[model samples]
Target: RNLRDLLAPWVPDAPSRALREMTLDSRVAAAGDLFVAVVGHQADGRRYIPQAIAQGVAAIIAEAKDEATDGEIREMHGVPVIYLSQLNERLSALAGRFYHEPSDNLRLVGVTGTNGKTTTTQLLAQWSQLLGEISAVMGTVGNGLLGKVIPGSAVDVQHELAGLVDQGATFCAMEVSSHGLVQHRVAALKFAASVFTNDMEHYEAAKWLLYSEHHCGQAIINADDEVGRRWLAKLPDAVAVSMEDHINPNCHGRWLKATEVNYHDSGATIRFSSSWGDGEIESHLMGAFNVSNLLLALATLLALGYPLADLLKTAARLQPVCGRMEVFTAPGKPTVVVDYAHTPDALEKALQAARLHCAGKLWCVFGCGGDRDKGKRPLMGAIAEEFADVAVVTDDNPRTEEPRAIINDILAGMLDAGHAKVMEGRAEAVTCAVMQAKENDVVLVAGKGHEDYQIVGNQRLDYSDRVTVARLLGVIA
Candidate 1:
């Protein structure tokens, strides 16, 4: 589409010209490209306007300000310039137009929350692909097809989704962060389904999922959530999806709720009853949180016109996402569960989940990263003491901070500190736990679950929790 036709709806009487691409950075602004000058926190893109002009940008959309005394529309040499009062707020719309609304080209399922966005989005994308449609995902793990995701952005969001459509992806599951939503990064695109993974901590972020009564087409609510409970009847064409005690037979709308769930080392087996019918789900993902995540995905796909039996048939194939309650067990070694649980709440729940399948002792090995949330260290120390049979304090990312100093903070939180063992080296700490643990004991290696590097004194060295644990157990070479 030409620039004029693309911007016609948003910008009246836009100049006639075709665009090669849309960009905010002047360095990448090429001839025939649309350069957008936004006022960001750190720097203003307007400062790079002269650079963009020199780089041969076809046109420019700059934030309206007092300095640009000329007016909204001006001719900078031969290029067209359009000024907007709300450039940052309108960026998503502008990008959407230029990209032909790539989200509209595909069946998009958007999952939001603090904890399960990555898992839920991955599940949705993976489950959809199992139904024989090409699928892609965008989240913390990254963005792309299953097992091959590249990391993070927004102008980049539309661009990448457009690329996925071009690559034959018919379905896309995206993780929508609270930051992304409030920034209007995901402002203009329409989603086929919107799923609430859990109760979002941010109240305003909670409003983002229901940006409008119709913003997210066909909504799936995790009714167990306080946020979801309050927003239930407000959704026009919505479904209540749950794995907790929020299933109300008297309440309205289509519902898919779980009645029973068994979490094992392999995964979970769930029994659910829906407005459609009662069914069983054999999920290869551990934890009640994951069962909730699965049902949300199931409800979302079913709401989007997928066959119920097709989803159930492929349900068992959904495996545990990497670094999230990932389990590793050997013939003689204890069951080692790795998770990215650094906070008090997350660490507490991880141990509780590990407790489910453990026949013997439950062990928690965790530490706080340097230069971040020092307050959480002691809180985590308290949780580990209360939850785990044995708590092992270890270094997570002691960047620039002395390892012993960080350990002292964690120790301060524990009562009688005698119950906990302090270990400086994370690798040694994990190795110590796994080696000493009996076969019946369950060991949890928390913090930096799937990460391949550890930061110390401003340097990142090669390291991986999974790789380290596997090697120690002789599971891998």
Candidate 2:
């Protein structure tokens, strides 16, 4: 399309120029391309306008709140320079327009919270795909259709959705992070449904901003959390999904509740009733949170008008999220569960969930990431010490930081710190835990779930907890 036509909505009188693609980086700007220049916290993209012009960029969109008025048009080196006020905040809308509002073409559902966001979004995508829609997912793991998520800028977000739409995808489930909300990454995304999984102080407000300020079509809230209950009270039409019997029975509003959940050696059998209809689900996913995630997914699709019976039929087929409570077992081997439980809260929950199927001791093999929330290191240590029978501290992406130092920080949190074994090599740590533990025992490899690479210093080493544990336990990853 031409630059004039693209800017017609914002700037009525604009120069016409052939456009090929849109980019934020000046380095990638080429002939017939639009380069967006924004003023960021650390650097200003406007400073690189000369570089973009040298590359023969046909047009440039510059953040001009500090220097000029909105929609102010200028020219440099025979290229159109379109000035936009608050360009950073308006990137999503601009991208949405450029991408032809791709979200409108698909049933997009956004799942947000402190935890369970990845699992919940994955479940939504899987369940919707099962119900006959070509579904996709975007989150911490990656972004693409269902199993192909390769994994964003605000522009990158819209571009990805447009790509999915081009692939004939009818639905997309995305994880909306607190930072994404604050930064307006999803500001222009017209979500068909917005889901609240659970939340912190300012964190809670950031998550709530999506529903309060953004264009979230239908709201689906988890009734289990205090904040969710408060939100549900305010939003009458919002669908409520609860696993702890938290749904208000008196309300006539739409709701999904798990009547009974039986956790077994393999998975859980959930008997639930919702506003759509009543049905039982034999879910292969482990943990109570997973059950909650399943319920949330069911409620989301149901709100979107999918039949309850159809969802139940596909419930058994819905697989666990990659490296998210992924279970692996072999004959005469300890049951091994891999999860991305890096935080103290998630680690505690992972251990508590793993304890359900453990016939013998519960072994926790985990470590904290370097240069990130050092306070949580000891907190996670205390959690593992209290929850698991045995704890093995190992290196988990100690980028530029000493692995031994990170291990010591974790050990400091434990009551009997010396009791927990320290292993520098993550592979050896996992092997030691799995080999020494009895067959009936259950081992949880936390901090690095779906990640296949480990960061040592500046180098990224080929390492995977799933692959390592699977090989050690004689099971396929």
Candidate 3:
């Protein structure tokens, strides 16, 4: 497309040249590239204009400032330089246009919240693919197009979406952070559905922007989530997903909730009744939280026109993620679950979920990360002390902070530190838990769930809870 046509809705006049790709980093700007320079958190992107020019970029779009006045055009090194008055605010839209509005091209669904965004997004991507739409996910784990992904830029957002659509993916699930929403990272691209999870106030207002400002399409919410129930009342066509029978009787749109959930030796079996359809779903996943995750995905897919029969048939096939409720067992050892439950509520919930299926002792082996949230350390300590039969306090990526100090903070919340078992070395601690726990006991490895590395001051050591457990269980680590 010509520069004028590409910039028709946002930019106008004069530059009628053909364009190729858009970039914020000038180092990669080359022939046929549209170099976008903005005043960033760090160094000025404007300074890299010369580098972009040297790299043979065709045109330039910079944040409206001194170099080029708002909406003003200038000639730089024989290339057109365009300044956008609200460049940062309109970057997503600009990138969307440059990338040919890929959100509209695919059945793009965005999962937003503080915690469950990654898991919800992965579930959407996975379930949608299970129902036969070529699926992809983009989130904390990564930018998944057909598979798993990472966090990139606004340009990365549009470019990746366009690429995914180009690769014939009909559906894409994105984990949108609160910052990403406020910064207008997904401002321009249209979303087919926006599924939200728990966490209120700050996340509430941020996700509210998805419908109010960003014009997100369908609203799929988790009614099991406290704030999500309130959100259900606000959204017109909202689909409420829950496990605790929180489905509003006066719900405006569609809603789904598990009437009964039975946790067993296998994962859990949920008998749910929804506005769309009612059926029994045998979940191979763990936790009531995951039940909410699956229900939310079921609602989203159902809202998107996937037949209820297909969703019900495929629901049993959905598996647990790498570190979120990942289960491990041996013939004569404890049933161990390695989960990324870092917060007080998460650890509590993980323990509660484990209690359902555990025929024996429920043990929690977890710790607080160093150099971050000392407050939560004690809170988590309290939960472990209150909830588990045996609380094994250990290190969880004690980065740049004293491990002993962190442990002490955790112990601060415990009334009886006598009941708590303190183990400093993470690997040895995990080994100790797996080796010592009896056959009827259930062990939980929390905090560093899927993470494979641990940080100690300046050192990043190789460490994985799963690997450690496997090694101790006489399996390949």
Scored by TM-score, the top model is 1
- In order, the Cα lDDT scores of the candidates are 0.83, 0.89, 0.82
lDDT of 1 by residue, 63-145 (tens): 88754632367778788888877777677777888888898889988888777888888889889999998899987777787
After superposing candidate 3, which stretches have Cα over 4 Å from the reference? 10-12, 39-51, 63-73, 146-152, 199-210, 330-333, 342-346, 367-382, 393-413, 421-432, 435-440, 452-464, 467-477
Determine which window of 10 residues in candidate 2 has minimal summed lDDT.
199-208
Compose the digit string of candidate 2's lDDT tens values, residues 1-477: 678887878999999888888899888888888899988778899999999999999899999868778998888988889899988888999888888899999999999888889889989998898888999998887888988888568998998889999999999999998778888899999999999998366665765665576899889999998989988988889998998889897879999999998876567889888878788898888888889888988898889888877888788998887778888888888988999999998899899999987889999999999977799999999999999999999999999988899999999999999889888799999999989999889999999888999999999999999999878877778
Of candidates 3 and 2, the better by lDDT: 2
Per-model TM-score versus the true fold = 0.86, 0.83, 0.83
Best by lDDT: 2
Q: Which ten contiguous residues of candidate 3 have the minimum total lDDT?
A: 143-152
Candidate 3: residue 392 Cα off by (Å) = 3.2
How many clashes in candidate 2?
1
What lDDT, from 0 to 1, does candidate 2 have?
Answer: 0.89
Off by over 4 Å in 2: 42-44, 64-69, 199-213, 329-334, 340-346, 365-382, 390-441, 445-475
Alpha-carbon RMSD of each model: 3.8, 4.2, 4.0
Error of 1 at 245 (Å): 2.9
Model 3 residue 477 CA deviation (Å) reads 7.8
